Design a protein around this nucleic acid. Structure first.
Length: 49
DNA sequence: CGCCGTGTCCCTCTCCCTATAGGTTAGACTTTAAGTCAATAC
């Protein structure tokens, strides 16, 4: 996002900067959740082989 | 005229009432194993 956020968490974010941060936060959380299953399947296949 | 590669698509796997005939059980009668007492001997 080319804006970008220009406030630290000590100064306190504005409304739009926080709303922009929420994108990446939720994306990372969901990506981690799917990465667990990916790692599990890789482990199972390598164990079988 | 006669056969072979490439492409697309489909599919699969993963994360009512009546009438007859026959079998079943429940219920009571007489018999039997069972619980009981009284006298006795060592």
């Amino acid at each position: 996002i080319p804006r970008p956020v220009k406030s630290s968490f000590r100064e306190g974010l504005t409304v739009l900067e926080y709303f922009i941060n929420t994108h990446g936060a939720r994306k990372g959380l969901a990506d981690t959740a799917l990465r667990t299953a990916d790692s599990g399947y890789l482990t199972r296949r390598l164990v079988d082989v």
